[PDB]
Amino acid sequence: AKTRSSRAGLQFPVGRVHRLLRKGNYAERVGAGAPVYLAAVLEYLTAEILELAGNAARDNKKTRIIPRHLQLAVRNDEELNKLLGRVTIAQGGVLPNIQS
Amino acid sequence: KTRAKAKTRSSRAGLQFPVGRVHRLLRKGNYAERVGAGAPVYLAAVLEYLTAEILELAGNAARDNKKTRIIPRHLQLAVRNDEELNKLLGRVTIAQGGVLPNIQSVLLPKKTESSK
Amino acid sequence: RHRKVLRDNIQGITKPAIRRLARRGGVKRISGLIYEETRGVLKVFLENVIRDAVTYTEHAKRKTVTAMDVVYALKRQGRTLYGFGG
Amino acid sequence: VLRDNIQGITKPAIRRLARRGGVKRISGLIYEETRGVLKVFLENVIRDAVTYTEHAKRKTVTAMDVVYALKRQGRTLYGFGG
Amino acid sequence: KKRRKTRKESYAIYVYKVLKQVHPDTGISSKAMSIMNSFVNDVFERIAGEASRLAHYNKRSTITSREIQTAVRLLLPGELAKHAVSEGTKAVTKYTSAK
Amino acid sequence: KDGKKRRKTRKESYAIYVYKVLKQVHPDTGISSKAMSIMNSFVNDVFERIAGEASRLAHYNKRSTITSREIQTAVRLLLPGELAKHAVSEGTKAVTKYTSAK
Amino acid sequence: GRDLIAYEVKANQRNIEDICICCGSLQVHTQHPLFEGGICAPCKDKFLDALFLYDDDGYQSYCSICCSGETLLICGNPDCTRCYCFECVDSLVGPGTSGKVHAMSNWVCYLCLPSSRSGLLQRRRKWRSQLKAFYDRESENPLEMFETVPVWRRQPVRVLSLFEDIKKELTSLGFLESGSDPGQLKHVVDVTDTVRKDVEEWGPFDLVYGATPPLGHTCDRPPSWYLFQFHRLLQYARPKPGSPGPFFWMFVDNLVLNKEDLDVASRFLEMEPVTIPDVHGGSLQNAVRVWSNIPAIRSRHWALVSEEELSLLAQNKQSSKLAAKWPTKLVKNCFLPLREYFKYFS
Ligand SMILES: [Zn+2]
Ligand SMILES: [Zn+2]
Ligand SMILES: [Zn+2]
């Protein structure tokens, strides 16, 4: 019994993404490679924010990621700020940016 | 075989928009597994009221402009003068519309007379 | 019946509350007429969000407004909130 | 020749668009600014509009690709789709 | 022409009849007709997608007139939603107990 | 041993997977439950975005199958800048690994 | 202390004038206008202000007797506008009766009942003149006060509508009887050739209403014309001096007269206008200025309503003119205090 997660070298569950595509009434049929591709994309987008949140945690002299660390991780990077421009992260605050 | 008057579902509801077309576009668009019987009748009634309101305001805008044919300028003036239709179609551009003739009250020269 | 009508709770939003929300917003100096306008804008914002959320509660055949109905009411208004279940 | 089509947007064109927008007076630095912004507003559409044309395995960018690229950015345009 | 046969549907023949019921002599151009066609498709896809979300939220695999009713109460602002819900309910009640 | 006291429906999440990815990128950094709820809501949000965009991409071309190409075009539309240019490489590498793992 | 004021009269054998019936207080400044008893000074000040204030939701925004906000009930007979709180009814006539009153919408109120002695309530004969004296002592403003018309000595209203019809409105408001046309409202589109003899021939008038054109400028006649003719026919329709007869008037402007004409109208009608805003559908909808001598009409204006925002709305309405209905519903409400003056048709 070899799971499709380790068959593609990924971490996010291929089967759960597959049944959430089949459950969400997106299309009549769902391809075999589509949950593998989408699990890889979600794994990369998770790993980048966890890397930046871990760097923000290390700057704050903390070994636990609080929602302030996810706030500073998303708002400092400009591509993740463009991705989450209309998204409020709870328990986050704002950037310490004072006008000159 | 069947021996009955071929009476369409639009005519039984007292509507104009096609119940059957709305029903097969609900069944085709992958919205849910099952689609109820009252839902295309209700949606055709909602669409027919929203069409009749804009065509009534566009016919008033055409009658104001001394024209017996609705041009997209008339639809533009019909939607944007109404506040609820402007709230509905805020992030919506209508082609060949233009904008409302609305000039701010500070860019005009003072056409007044000093009382003293 | 057994429900006293709550009133004048827009004055529950105190002057130092709007002061602290202007400190987080980066504002150095606040005029005296800011506070009534800020209460009015917060009231209209809560009107829109609760107007969506009570209708989400209505269609669900419940009488309890959940956090999921608040997240659906905000995600419908293009303000996606995290930390409460998407 | 292959660089000055951003200047194909002329000074009277931006003048007429700002008269429609209700602007009484325009400074001399508006015309360099607006040509920037309009150019960005084309890119964010055409980057999407080519991409639908990529997915359809075509080479023609149809009006439907422009309508879908504008509908994606919340700028739904009417009167080009049947 | 047997290979040149593809009929795209529209809403021209219906919006024309609603216009003749509202204004019995006013006409309409084809550009404004395409704008009314795109308007009907836009509001159709809005109410259908919103009702699909309102069905998926309550774990129900069926859209009925109740999901369309609450989707109209969400998407249309102000009195327009109230008049559209009144017209829809009147048309459904007329539809169910007809011949 | 005590078992099945209070029957509660198991609400699925992504918490243990985000935990695995965090231990792969930071071998000693922990994370709170509030931030874990935020990361769970983020994964649900971006999943709904890419799935809905792929559903529109499938419906526009009159096709009733979502393959990896619809997800690839949805990623190229939704992720701005270098995020798409790396996520497409990661997804294509994963699909190439998945097809030739037998 | 509300169950104590029903104990100070029965047991202690005290005068009702020596206890504040509003908030239960023992300190009495004056005597209560409607009923026999005393009122403490703050409740007295607030009570006068409450009458002036006009509420869209109910006949009275705050309670008549004690001036409380909540616990509002509606009068049974539809020809009466009085509204009392639940705590007044419980405190005075007895506990568990307020619920019974509120339970029906056809419960005859205290002023409509043949006997006005409920158990702890006393009516006043010719109370309106005493009420005018009450306004005269402290209200600091002698607002136009016509004698109140009793239900037993009630007359059919004779209405003269100039430049605008209100028969639909008054019919909805219960001033005109439907089904029967004796002609108690005469709509007169053109009045340039009306003469005192004509008005005398038309029968004596009690209420003369006029209103400006709707925002679509239907007619090509300057809007001040409606005001000036309204004033003229108004003066003609006023009863012979030295006669106990009610004469009410109301001129309504939907922002069609500028500040010049506004001051002119304010000068002739000898009072400041009344600006009324309509229910916000996001920002602001429309507004209307009203002159009248009808009670609780001057205090209807809301201090929040600014002039500049009103000017902007006027200029966006005049130039756009999307809707062109006279706002009958906007000026419909303002006649509501008049209900106690003429007969109501349900
Ligand atoms: Zn008192
Ligand atoms: Zn009464
Ligand atoms: Zn009271």
From Swiss-Prot, chain A:
Q: Which residues carry this modification: N6-succinyllysine?
A: K82
Keywords, sorted A to Z: Acetylation, Chromosome, DNA-binding, Hydroxylation, Isopeptide bond, Methylation, Nucleosome core, Nucleus, Phosphoprotein, Ubl conjugation
List residues, modification N6-glutaryllysine.
K82
Q: Where is this cross-link: Glycyl lysine isopeptide (Lys-Gly) (interchain with G-Cter in ubiquitin)?
A: K2
Q: Where's it found, cell-wise?
A: Nucleus; Chromosome
| Modified residue annotations for N6-(2-hydroxyisobutyryl)lysine | K23, K61, K62, K82
GO MF assignments: DNA binding; protein heterodimerization activity; structural constituent of chromatin
Q: Which GO terms describe its cellular component?
A: nucleosome; nucleus
| Posttranslational modification | Following DNA double-strand breaks (DSBs), it is ubiquitinated through 'Lys-63' linkage of ubiquitin moieties, leading to the recruitment of repair proteins to sites of DNA damage. H2AK119Ub and ionizing radiation-induced 'Lys-63'-linked ubiquitination are distinct events. Glutamine methylation at Gln-91 (H2AQ104me) by FBL is specifically dedicated to polymerase I. It is present at 35S ribosomal DNA locus and impairs binding of the FACT complex.
Q: Which residues carry this modification: N5-methylglutamine?
A: Q91
Q: Report the function annotation for this chain.
A: Core component of nucleosome. Nucleosomes wrap and compact DNA into chromatin, limiting DNA accessibility to the cellular machineries which require DNA as a template. Histones thereby play a central role in transcription regulation, DNA repair, DNA replication and chromosomal stability. DNA accessibility is regulated via a complex set of post-translational modifications of histones, also called histone code, and nucleosome remodeling.
Q: Which family does it belong to?
A: Belongs to the histone H2A family.
Q: What is this protein called?
A: Histone H2A type 1
Source species, please?
Answer: Xenopus laevis
From Swiss-Prot, chain D:
One Gene Ontology biological process: nucleosome assembly
| Cross-link entry Glycyl lysine isopeptide (Lys-Gly) (interchain with G-Cter in ubiquitin), positions | K71
Q: Which organism is it from?
A: Xenopus laevis
List residues modified as N6-lactoyllysine: K11, K57, K71
- The N6-butyryllysine modification is found at K11, K24, K57, K59, K71
Recorded protein name is Histone H4
| Residues annotated with N6-succinyllysine modification | K11, K57, K71
Q: How is it modified after translation?
A: Demethylation is performed by JMJD6. Monomethylation is performed by KMT5A/SET8. Trimethylation is performed by KMT5B and KMT5C and induces gene silencing.
Record-listed N6-(2-hydroxyisobutyryl)lysine modification sites: K11, K24, K39, K57, K59, K71
UniProtKB/Swiss-Prot annotation, chain F:
Q: What is its main location?
A: nucleus
Annotated glycosylation sites:
S89
Keyword set includes DNA-binding? yes
| Tagged with keyword Acetylation | yes
Q: Which GO terms describe its cellular component?
A: nucleosome; nucleus
Assembly and oligomerization: The nucleosome is a histone octamer containing two molecules each of H2A, H2B, H3 and H4 assembled in one H3-H4 heterotetramer and two H2A-H2B heterodimers. The octamer wraps approximately 147 bp of DNA.
**Role of this protein:** Core component of nucleosome. Nucleosomes wrap and compact DNA into chromatin, limiting DNA accessibility to the cellular machineries which require DNA as a template. Histones thereby play a central role in transcription regulation, DNA repair, DNA replication and chromosomal stability. DNA accessibility is regulated via a complex set of post-translational modifications of histones, also called histone code, and nucleosome remodeling.
Q: So what family is this one in? A: Belongs to the histone H2B family.
Q: What is this protein called?
A: Histone H2B 1.1
* Species annotation: Xenopus laevis (African clawed frog)
Q: What is the covered span of the full protein?
A: 25 to 126 of 126
Swiss-Prot record, chain G:
A biological process from GO: DNA methylation-dependent constitutive heterochromatin formation
Record-linked InterPro entries? ADD, DNMT3_ADD_GATA1-like, DNMT3_ADD_PHD, SAM-dependent_MTases_sf, Znf_FYVE_PHD, Znf_RING/FYVE/PHD
State the SUPFAM superfamilies in the record: FYVE/PHD zinc finger
Q: In which tissues is it expressed?
A: Expressed at low levels in several tissues including testis, ovary, and thymus.
Positions of the ADD domain = 8-140
UniProt keywords, alphabetically = Differentiation, Metal-binding, Nucleus, Spermatogenesis, Zinc, Zinc-finger
Q: Which GO terms describe its cellular component?
A: catalytic complex; condensed nuclear chromosome; cytoplasm; cytosol; ESC/E(Z) complex; heterochromatin; nucleus
Q: Where are the zinc fingers (GATA-type)?
A: 19-49
Tell me the compartments it is located in.
Answer: Nucleus
| Quaternary context | Homodimer. Heterotetramer composed of 1 DNMT3A homodimer and 2 DNMT3L subunits (DNMT3L-DNMT3A-DNMT3A-DNMT3L). Interacts with histone H3 (via N-terminus); interaction is strongly inhibited by methylation at lysine 4 (H3K4me). Interacts with EZH2; the interaction is direct. Interacts with SPOCD1.
Q: What else is known?
A: Interaction with histone H3 is strongly inhibited by methylation at lysine 4 (H3K4me).
- Put simply, this protein is called DNA (cytosine-5)-methyltransferase 3-like
